[PDB]
Amino acid sequence: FFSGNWKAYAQNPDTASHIFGSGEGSGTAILTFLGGFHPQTKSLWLTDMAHHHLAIAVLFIVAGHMYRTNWLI
Amino acid sequence: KSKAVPFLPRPAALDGSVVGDVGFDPVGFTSWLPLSYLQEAEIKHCRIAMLATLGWIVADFVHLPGAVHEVSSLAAHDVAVKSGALAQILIWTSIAEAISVIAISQMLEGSGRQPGDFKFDPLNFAKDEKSLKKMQLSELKNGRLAMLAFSGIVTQAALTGHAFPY
Amino acid sequence: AQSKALPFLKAPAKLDGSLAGDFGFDPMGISDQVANLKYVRAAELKHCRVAMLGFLGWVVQQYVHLPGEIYAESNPLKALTSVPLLSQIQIFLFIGAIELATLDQTYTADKPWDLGFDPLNFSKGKSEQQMKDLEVKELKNGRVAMIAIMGLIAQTLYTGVPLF
Amino acid sequence: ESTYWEGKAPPSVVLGPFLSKIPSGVLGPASLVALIVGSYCTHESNIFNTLTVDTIYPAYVLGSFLTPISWGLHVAAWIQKMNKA
Numbered sequence A: 001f002f003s004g005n006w007k008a009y010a011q012n013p014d015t016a017s018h019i020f021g022s023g024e025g026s027g028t029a030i031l032t033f034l035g036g037f038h039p040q041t042k043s044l045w046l047t048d049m050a051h052h053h054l055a056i057a058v059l060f061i062v063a064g065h066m067y068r069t070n071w072l073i
Numbered sequence B: 001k002s003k004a005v006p007f008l009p010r011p012a013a014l015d016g017s018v019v020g021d022v023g024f025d026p027v028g029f030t031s032w033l034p035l036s037y038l039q040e041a042e043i044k045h046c047r048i049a050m051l052a053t054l055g056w057i058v059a060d061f062v063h064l065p066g067a068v069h070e071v072s073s074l075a076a077h078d079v080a081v082k083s084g085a086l087a088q089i090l091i092w093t094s095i096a097e098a099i100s101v102i103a104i105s106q107m108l109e110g111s112g113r114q115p116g117d118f119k120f121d122p123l124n125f126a127k128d129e130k131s132l133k134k135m136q137l138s139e140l141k142n143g144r145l146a147m148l149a150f151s152g153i154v155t156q157a158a159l160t161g162h163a164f165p166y
Numbered sequence C: 001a002q003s004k005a006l007p008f009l010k011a012p013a014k015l016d017g018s019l020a021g022d023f024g025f026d027p028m029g030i031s032d033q034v035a036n037l038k039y040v041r042a043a044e045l046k047h048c049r050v051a052m053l054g055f056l057g058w059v060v061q062q063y064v065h066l067p068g069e070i071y072a073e074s075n076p077l078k079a080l081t082s083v084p085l086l087s088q089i090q091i092f093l094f095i096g097a098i099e100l101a102t103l104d105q106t107y108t109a110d111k112p113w114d115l116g117f118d119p120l121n122f123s124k125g126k127s128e129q130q131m132k133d134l135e136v137k138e139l140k141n142g143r144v145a146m147i148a149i150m151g152l153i154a155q156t157l158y159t160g161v162p163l164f
Numbered sequence D: 001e002s003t004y005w006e007g008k009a010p011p012s013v014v015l016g017p018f019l020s021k022i023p024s025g026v027l028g029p030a031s032l033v034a035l036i037v038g039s040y041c042t043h044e045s046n047i048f049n050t051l052t053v054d055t056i057y058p059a060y061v062l063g064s065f066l067t068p069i070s071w072g073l074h075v076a077a078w079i080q081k082m083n084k085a
Ligand code: CLA
Pocket: C005, C015, C019, C020, C021, C022, C023, C024, C025, C026, C030, C031, C037, C040, C041, C042, C043, C044, C047, C143, C144, C146, C147, C150
C-alpha cells in the first residue's frame, strides 16, 4: 500500500475449489476483481466486496470536501 | 517596467515586498493566486530545499551512527522507509502541515500573519525591521539557490553514481 | 499572535484570560461550538486525573504487586485479563458511584471540575495567585501524563514491553 | 457576490476566486490540451491496450481525470471570454 504496489493485494485470489470457512483451496488476496459468484456459496466474492467498499470509501471521503467550511475553500 | 525582465511589463500584483520583489512574473501567476499564498508556498519550498540540500550533502559524507545508515542518500529513501525513520518524520511533518493549514487560513482571511512567518526566532538572530527584511531577502535567495542545487543534485546522482561532485 | 502555544495563530474568542492553563491552543476551533468552556474543562481535568493515576499505577504495577497471586501479573494489559472480574467490577462500581452524583453536578454547575475534594486542605489559606499556579501545575502534569499513558498503552500493544 | 444572472453569460464570480482571474486565452488552449491529454490517456489505458492488473499507470488514470476536468475548463474559458476577460 505504501510502496504503491497495490497489485500485490490482488495476487493469488481464492480458487474455484475453495470451501467457504475452510483453508482448502483458499488464497491470500484481499482486494480483487473477479465478478460473478463464489463457485461454492453462489454469492459475491468477499474480496470483491472489500474492494467495492474501499473504492466507495475513497470516493465518498473525496466527495465530502466539496462544501465550504471554516477554511475558506 | 519590470526590474527583472526589462522587456515585459512589471507584474500588476508586485509593487513592494521585503521578500525580494524584483518583478519577476512573466506568466502572471500573481494574478491567478493571492500573492500571500504564493509567498508562503515559495518560503516553504525554500526551507525544505535548503534542509534537503544540506542533508543530502552531509549524509553522503558523514552519516553512519549505526548499520542501516550505511547508504548513499540515493538508496537511503527506500532503506529508511523500511527502517521506519521516514514514517516518524512524515508523522511530525503532517502534524506541522495540518497546523499550517489554519495558519494559511488565518491569513488570506484577516489577522496579521506575514507569509512564511511562524514566530520561530528562539536565538533572536533578527532584531529590528531592517535586519528582518535583509535576512528575509537572504533566506529567500538562499532557498531559491538551494531549490536549483537540490534539483541538480538529484538529477546528477540519478544520471550517474558518484559522490559530492555528482 | 494571541496563542502562546502556536505563536502564529490567533486564538479563538473563548480562549482568554481566566481558566488557568489557557495557552491559546485550539487550532481546530472546537471551543467555538461549545456554549462555554466549563464542560470541556471538566472533561479535560477528569482525563488529566485519570491519566495521572493510570501512569502511577502502570509504574507501580511494573515494580510493586499485592501479596496475592492474582495480582502477580507485571504487564498491565495482561493483568487486565488475569485479574479476576470481581476486582474489576468492584472498581467499576466504586467509580460509577462517584460518577453518578458528579453526573448530576457537571452538566449544570459553574465549576464542574470542582468536586470539593481536598481532605488535606492543601488549598485552605492559599491566595488566588497560588491557587491559579496549583491549577496550572495540575493541568500541565495531567496533559503530560495523558500523552505518557497513551504512549505506554501503545508501546505495550505494539512491542509487549510495558516500560522503557 | 450575486451569482444569479439573466444576461448572455454569468458573471466571472461563479468561477471562484482562482478562475475569475484567468484570461480566456489561457483557459481555452489549456482546456483543449487537457481534453486531448485525457482522451489519449483513456485510450492508452484502455481501448488501444486492454487493461490488466499489472498495467494501471497512475499517469493514465490521473490523466483520464483531465477529461471530466477539461469540460469545466472550457466552460470557464467561454464564461471568461464572454465577460471581456
Ligand atoms: C481528553 C483530552 C482533552 C480534552 C477534553 C481537552 C480539553 C481542552 N483543552 Mg487540552 N490538551 C490535551 C487533552 C485534552 N484537552 C492534551 C493531551 C494536551 C497536551 C498536548 C493538551 C494541551 C492543551 C493546551 C496547551 C491548551 C488546551 C486547552 C483546552 C481547552 C480548550 C480546547 C478545546 O475546547 O478542546 C477540546 C478538546 C477535545 C474535545 C478533544 C478532541 C479530541 C481530538 C480530536 C484529539 C484527537 C487525537 C489527537 C490528535 C492525538 C492523540 C493521540 C496521541 C498522539 C496522544 C479544553 C478545556 C486550551 C485551554 O486551556 O483553554 C481553556 C489550551 O490553551 N489543551
